Design a binder for this molecule. Structure first.
Ligand SMILES: [Ca+2]
Length: 188
C-alpha cells in the first residue's frame, strides 16, 4: 500500500476500537470500499492490524504522559510510567477489548510485537534524553534498559488477564526503580 491507503485503513480500524466494536475485517473492507484481498495486502491479518492500532494508541499515551510528568531523572521516569499505567488501567475501550478477546490481547501486549516495540523505543528515547540532560547514570544502553522496563512492567499492568486480582502498578514501579538503581520508600 501507499502510506495514505494504510493510514485510511488504520484510522478506520482505530475508530472501531474507540467505538468498542470488534475489528471485523469484512466490515472494515466494506467501510474502505475495498475487497478483502486488497485489505489483507495493505495491513495483514486482524491481529497485525489490531497490534498497529494499539501501538499507535500506546504512543499517544506515552507522549501525553511525557509532557505532563514532573521532575528529572529517575523521578521523572517513574512519573511517566505511573501515568501511562494508570491511563491504560482506566481505558474503557481497552476494557471492552480485553473482556471480549483476552487471548488475542495477551499475545499482542506481552509477546514481542507492535505494542512492546513502540513502548521499548519510546522508553529508550526517555532514557537517552535523561542521560543527555545529565540527569541519569546508566551502565546498559537505553535500548537494552527500555526493552527491560517494558518486559518487567507489562505482566504487572495486565495481571488480571494472567489470573490475578488487579493491575499491579506499584509492583511495576518498584521494578522500574530497581532497574534504575533507585529506592522507593513505601509507607501505609
Ligand atoms: Ca502516500
Amino acid at each position: 500500500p501507499t502510506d495514505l491507503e494504510r493510514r485510511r485503513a488504520i484510522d478506520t480500524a482505530a475508530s472501531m476500537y474507540l467505538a468498542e466494536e470488534p475489528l471485523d475485517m469484512s466490515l472494515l473492507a466494506e467501510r474502505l470500499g475495498v475487497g478483502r484481498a486488497t485489505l489483507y495486502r495493505w495491513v495483514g491479518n486482524r491481529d497485525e492490524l489490531l497490534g498497529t492500532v494499539l501501538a499507535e494508541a500506546t504512543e499517544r499515551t506515552y507522549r501525553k504522559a511525557m509532557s505532563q510528568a514532573s521532575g528529572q531523572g529517575p523521578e521523572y521516569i517513574l512519573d511517566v510510567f505511573g501515568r501511562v499505567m494508570r491511563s491504560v488501567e482506566s481505558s474503557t475501550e481497552l476494557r471492552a477489548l480485553t473482556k471480549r478477546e483476552p487471548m488475542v490481547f495477551i499475545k499482542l501486549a506481552m509477546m514481542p510485537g507492535s505494542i512492546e516495540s513502540i513502548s521499548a523505543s519510546i522508553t529508550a528515547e526517555i532514557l537517552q534524553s535523561q542521560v543527555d540532560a545529565g540527569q541519569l547514570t546508566i551502565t546498559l544502553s537505553p535500548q537494552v534498559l527500555g526493552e527491560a522496563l517494558v518486559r518487567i512492567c507489562d505482566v504487572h499492568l495486565y495481571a488480571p488477564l494472567l489470573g490475578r486480582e488487579k493491575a499491579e502498578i506499584e509492583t511495576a514501579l518498584d521494578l522500574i526503580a530497581l532497574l534504575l538503581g533507585v529506592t522507593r520508600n513505601h509507607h501505609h
